[PDB]
Design a protein around this ligand. Structure first.
Ligand SMILES: [Ca+2]
Length: 991
């Protein structure tokens, strides 16, 4: 049966020809030899310059004059050619006598090709409402064509029609990355052609082995697997008639958009529901290709799978999956075509034997848009989504080629593309950053990074230890990103604040990335294995020879253990992500992760039905990820679950406690640069941390909630990470909300097991000293309120459905509409009762100042002075050594002895733009919501900011490109730091 029956739809399934179709100097007939729908098509056998005339009301309708409806009326056909001709058909559309619109259609192809052409945009001339004739003018030569699936005119999503070799003129304006297969296939290389050397030929052989092993591992073909294959394959009804291939027509899902304005009950996924879509088809081909490689040479099953693969190949190529073919509409083809590339690659040698390899090679190159690899990168970094989706297809298509100089040129081009793609990207752009941050949607986004890393990681390894290897810079950048991720995840899970739009506590890092990079070798190429990567890997899969599921990962892991590699100890020290506004302190097995936001970096991503209540995720959050020594750190072990969680009381934040219906994100489409999303960045540049000797550090932020919600709410918050202690300081907390209280939350923890319930039965706890059921201590000198809510009510992050759980909370109660609120408390994770009582009697720190100007603090035992300087300090700074500062910044001083001092400085202002905050103001003076994508500075290089420090006494320093001594006398020593990227710059001082 033909899908969709309509007066405008010509499918030729009737025994007699339609009376309205007549042929001039040509013969017409119903043929069953080729068909795109039903079981028949129109055979049009023509003499030179013969016409095919369809005399019926074409039912073209002019575009909506109001502009409300953007759909354009389109003509749609499928043409079949048995004999390719270096010529073109002309399509003519006439009202009564005269032609109004026309378009050319190339016929230099074998098989089915489509054309979706919009009357108003893509056609020559001007279309008219009421035209009632279709002419198909043949070229000045004889030949034959089969016509099927002809829709005269119907309204269609105007964005989606794609150009190819048959219709290069279609949608000339578009820059849609999905639709530019033809445009970008025309691109030419700039890397010069060279012949292939013996070493280079062996290297290409090596990339193929590496790639085959990557997508495939030898296995067994079960009787069940074989029966499933036969059942799925038979439904396609692939058969041969007089040398011609036919079978059930296969479309890619979006081809349904043709019938959108045609059927009342339209379903976008109707073709998938019919088993007629491409994903299933190419999935089966992969399935069969795998089965062939898992069978003994000369066996009946191997011959059977070889036979089935080729039959499926012939049919899909006949249907139009070939070079220079885009089926009229190709948007979002990526997902349907995922199986294509591995299926064809696994079947290289057999395709060559059949004389079909060159063809196969070209179709892969076409659909992977491999020529996009030709251009010289203009800068560092590419879209994370490129690494995520474009790597597999492109590399497979290149490995399909014969060992020719053209293949080497492609390889050189591909390596160059990956190389610059991995390099530190500027601003909020690219993929990877100098400090280890990984960007997508213009912030650090682990959930997306994870997918992008798959590509980058796999391609680095593929090209590794070879003349085509990527630069040290590219290799080290990705390595550092992975090392950072291992640091801020604990053990494998993303922290809550870094969950993006999925705060479900499920997102994890991928151990594979580490194992792949371990066998990639050191970034310089001098080491066969990467030691840091290997031991990082073995920690992440440590059981507590490891146990793993994925076959190719198990192979690598076996190699690493045999080569004597052991698991990492839990990473120690301090991380500061300038790109992402995150600081992490790590001692023992625990971690403390701080996250804020700036005028460059958004607080939280809100989508429809995703992350409804996460407004406060970056309001200076501080999550403690922990577990009893010996057990793996999990959100569950760190005292977090989704059900029952008070979304207002994100650990560490200063926020106004709202009812969930008021806390929910009011998601809007704010401008043309975005969709239904909320991504709120502040108007303050001062947010970030410093990292001293990768061991300790501090964090500071000027918190300022967006005017969309509680815009009066602002605060100065700081974190000070000294050894196994995190001291939290706050001042200048203020808002004008008199309906709901402002709170900083010391901790909010889930009570799950029996032992947790028994611990809280009467635990007071004191006193100036608290200790939870997870073994972490809290020194709280200020007045604080304790809540034991068994149970506590909340809602799901996505669905909003009511959830409950047993929760325990300690909060610092600022009033309703505070004027100048403040707090001071310290967190010591993985401690004991004894240390805590001793800490209460003699705190290991002393506050030097705590106001709008600065939060300064020292620890005599650790020999450390911490400076969070919010403003230029007009006055002599406390501490004894650091006297004055040029501009608002972060400083930390460590005293080795009276003679040796370690000085470290950071400038949290990323400086993507230089002036006052980029803002669009209201009639009343409120900040207007504008999506980050709309800002013109999002790709800017981080600006250099000079920071000058004044130090007491004579000091000698070794000069660096980033640190210079400016002025010097008997009393003072001033130094100038050249700051970038929110990075931490440090120097060693000697008296
Ligand atoms: Ca038909």
């Amino acid at each position: 049966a033909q899908i969709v029956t309509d007066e405008r739809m010509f499918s030729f399934e009737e025994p007699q020809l339609p009376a309205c179709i007549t042929g001039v100097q040509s013969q017409l007939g119903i043929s069953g030899a080729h068909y795109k729908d039903g079981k028949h098509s129109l055979e049009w056998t023509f003499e030179p310059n013969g016409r095919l005339e369809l005399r019926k009301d074409l039912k073209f309708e002019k575009k909506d004059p109001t502009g409300k409806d953007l759909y354009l009326s389109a003509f749609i056909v499928w043409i079949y050619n048995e004999q390719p001709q270096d010529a073109a058909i002309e399509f003519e559309f006439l009202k009564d006598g005269r032609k109004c619109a026309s378009f050319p259609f190339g016929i230099n192809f074998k098989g089915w090709r489509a054309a979706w052409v919009c009357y108003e945009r893509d056609m020559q001339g001007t279309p008219e409402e009421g035209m009632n004739e279709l002419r198909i003018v043949a070229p000045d030569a004889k030949g034959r064509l089969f016509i099927d699936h002809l829709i005269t005119a119907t309204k269609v999503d105007a964005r989606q029609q794609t150009a190819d070799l048959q219709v290069p003129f279609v949608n000339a304006g578009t820059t849609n990355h999905w639709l530019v297969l033809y445009k970008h296939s025309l691109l030419k290389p700039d890397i010069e052609l060279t012949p292939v050397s013996d070493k280079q030929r062996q290297e290409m052989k090596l990339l193929e082995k590496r790639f085959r092993d990557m997508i495939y591992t030898k296995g067994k073909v079960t009787e069940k697997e074989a029966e499933t294959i036969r059942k799925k394959y038979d439904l396609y009804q692939i058969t041969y008639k007089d040398g011609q291939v036919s079978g059930v027509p296969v479309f890619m899902v979006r081809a349904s958009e043709a019938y959108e304005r045609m059927i009342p009950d339209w379903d976008k996924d109707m073709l998938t529901k019919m088993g007629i879509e491409m994903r299933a088809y190419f999935d089966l081909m992969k399935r069969i290709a795998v089965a062939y490689n898992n069978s003994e040479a000369g066996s009946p099953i191997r011959k059977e799978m070889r036979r089935k693969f080729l039959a499926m190949y012939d049919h899909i190529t006949d249907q139009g999956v070939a070079y220079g073919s885009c089926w009229g509409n190709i948007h979002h083809y990526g997902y349907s075509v995922r199986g294509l590339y591995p299926a064809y690659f696994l079947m290289k040698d057999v395709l060559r034997e059949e004389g079909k390899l060159l063809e196969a090679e070209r179709t892969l190159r076409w659909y992977a848009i491999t020529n996009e690899v030709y251009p010289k990168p203009e800068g560092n970094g590419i879209d994370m989504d490129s690494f995520n989706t474009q790597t597999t297809g492109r590399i497979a298509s290149i490995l399909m080629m014969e060992d020719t100089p053209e293949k080497l040129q492609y390889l050189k081009s591909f390596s160059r593309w990956i190389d610059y793609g991995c390099r530190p990207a500027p601003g909020l752009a690219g993929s990877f950053k100098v400090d280890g941050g990984a960007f997508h949607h213009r912030n650090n986004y682990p959930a997306y990074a994870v997918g992008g890393l798959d590509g980058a990681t796999n391609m680095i390894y593929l090209f590794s230890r070879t003349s085509l290897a990527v630069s040290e810079l590219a290799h080290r950048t990705v390595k550092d990103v992975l090392l950072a991720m291992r640091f801020y995840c604990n053990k494998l899970n993303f922290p809550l604040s870094m969950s993006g739009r999925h705060p479900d506590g499920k997102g994890k890092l991928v151990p594979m990335h580490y194992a792949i990079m371990a066998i990639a070798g050191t970034p310089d190429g001098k080491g066969d294995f990467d030691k840091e990567m290997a031991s990082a890997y073995l920690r992440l899969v440590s059981s507590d020879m490891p146990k793993v599921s994925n076959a190719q990962e198990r192979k690598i892991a076996k190699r690493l253990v045999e080569n004597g590699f052991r698991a990492e100890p839990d990473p120690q020290g301090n991380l500061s992500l300038g790109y992402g506004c995150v600081s992490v302190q790590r001692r023992e097995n625990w971690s403390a992760v701080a996250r804020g936001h700036s005028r460059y970096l958004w607080a939280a991503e809100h989508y429809l039905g995703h992350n409804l209540y996460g407004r406060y995720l970056a309001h200076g959050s501080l999550q403690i990820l922990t577990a009893p020594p010996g057990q793996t750190v999990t959100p569950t072990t760190s005292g977090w679950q989704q059900e029952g969680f008070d979304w207002n009381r994100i650990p560490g934040v200063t926020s106004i406690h709202l009812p969930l219906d008021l806390l929910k994100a009011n998601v809007l489409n704010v401008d043309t640069f975005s969709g239904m999303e909320e991504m709120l960045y502040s108007d303050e540049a001062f947010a970030g941390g410093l990292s001293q000797g990768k061991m300790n550090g501090n964090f500071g932020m000027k918190l300022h909630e967006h005017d969309k919600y509680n815009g009066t709410h602002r605060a100065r918050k700081s974190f000070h990470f000294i050894d196994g202690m995190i001291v939290c300081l706050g001042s200048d907390i203020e808002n004008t909300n008199m309906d709901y209280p402002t709170e900083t939350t010391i901790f909010q923890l889930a009570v799950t097991d029996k032992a947790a319930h028994d611990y809280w039965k009467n635990n007071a706890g004191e006193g100036k000293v608290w200790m939870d059921h997870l073994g972490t201590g809290y020194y709280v000198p200020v007045a604080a309120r304790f809540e034991k809510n068994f149970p506590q009510y909340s809602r799901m992050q996505d669905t909003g459905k009511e959830t409950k759980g047993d929760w325990v909370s300690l909060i610092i109660d600022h009033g309703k509409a505070p004027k100048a609120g403040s707090y001071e408390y310290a967190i010591l994770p993985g401690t004991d009762r004894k240390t805590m009582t001793a800490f209460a009697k003699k705190p290991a720190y002393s506050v030097l100042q705590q106001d709008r100007n600065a939060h300064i603090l020292e620890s005599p035992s650790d020999r450390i002075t911490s400076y969070v300087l919010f403003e230029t300090p007009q006055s002599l700074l406390p501490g004894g050594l650091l006297q004055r500062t040029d501009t608002s910044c972060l400083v930390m001083v460590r005293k080795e002895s009276a003679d040796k001092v370690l000085l470290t400085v950071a400038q949290p202002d990323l400086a993507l733009y230089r002036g006052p905050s980029d803002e669009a103001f209201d009639k009343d003076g409120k900040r207007m919501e504008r999506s980050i994508y709309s800002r013109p500075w999002i790709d800017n290089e981080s600006g250099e900011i000079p920071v000058t420090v004044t130090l007491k006494g004579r000091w000698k320093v070794v000069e660096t490109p980033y640190c210079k001594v400016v002025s010097e006398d008997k009393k003072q020593t001033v130094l100038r730091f050249l700051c970038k990227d929110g990075a931490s710059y440090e120097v060693e001082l000697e008296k």
